[PDB]
């Protein structure tokens, strides 16, 4: 069997990337995290305090508490057949603002502006996204050239 040790199996997970050791850039501490934010957890081995447990590396959660150095995150953890909402305390070195919602937030604004710009114009615009449709018909110009004939090459034993 395996040991129940807290940091077992994190030889590569928590190590620093190649040629990125040493000082922690100070903009890691200048980020502003607010209640209700979405953050990606990524344990950093340089700071051994507030280190999220390995099961939370690479999971994204919601900030519910902010203290002097860490935040409280509500992050889903699956244990057998159930998913629990777990409240962890993680120092702000090990998290980073998620960009997932931005492409949504960027869309929310452009939609509301289009919905307001087209409304005053008495027209109709597309707001919902759509999956890529099958490409429509088109002509391909040969430009007075014959397509290159291709043939399979003979087998040659390159040993």
């Amino acid at each position: 069997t395996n040991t129940k040790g807290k940091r077992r199996g994190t030889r590569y997970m928590f190590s620093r990337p190649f040629r990125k050791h040493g000082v922690v850039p100070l903009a890691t501490y200048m980020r502003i995290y607010k209640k209700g934010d979405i953050v990606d957890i990524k344990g950093m081995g340089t700071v051994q305090k507030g280190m999220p447990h390995k099961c939370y590396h690479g999971k994204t959660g919601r900030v519910y508490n902010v203290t002097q150095h860490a935040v409280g995150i509500v992050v889903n953890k699956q244990v057998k057949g159930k998913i629990l909402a777990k409240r962890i305390n993680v120092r702000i070195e090990h998290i980073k603002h998620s960009k997932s919602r931005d492409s949504f937030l960027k869309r929310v604004k452009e939609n509301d502006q289009k919905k307001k710009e087209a409304k005053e114009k008495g027209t109709w615009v597309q707001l919902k996204r759509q999956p890529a449709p099958p490409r429509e018909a088109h002509f391909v110009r040969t430009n007075g050239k014959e397509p290159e004939l291709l043939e399979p090459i003979p087998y040659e034993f390159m040993a």
């Binding site: 508490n65 889903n76 998913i83 629990l84 409240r87």
Partner: protein, 56 residues
């Protein structure tokens, strides 16, 4: 006699019979675990809300 030791075989089949439900979400979340100092003031902010009722 020796016997089998461990297996998770057949387990994901049992987990999915009643579905792997995500946690229940309500629009109000409990204030359990939030900073005591911050919460002490939040109670004080709610306590005196009636003061500015007339201005509102």
């Amino acid at each position: 006699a020796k016997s089998k030791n461990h297996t998770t075989h057949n387990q994901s089949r049992k987990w999915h019979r009643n579905g792997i439900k995500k946690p229940r979400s309500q629009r109000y979340e409990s204030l359990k675990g939030v900073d005591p100092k911050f919460l002490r003031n939040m109670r004080f902010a709610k306590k005196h809300n009636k003061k500015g009722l007339k201005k509102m």
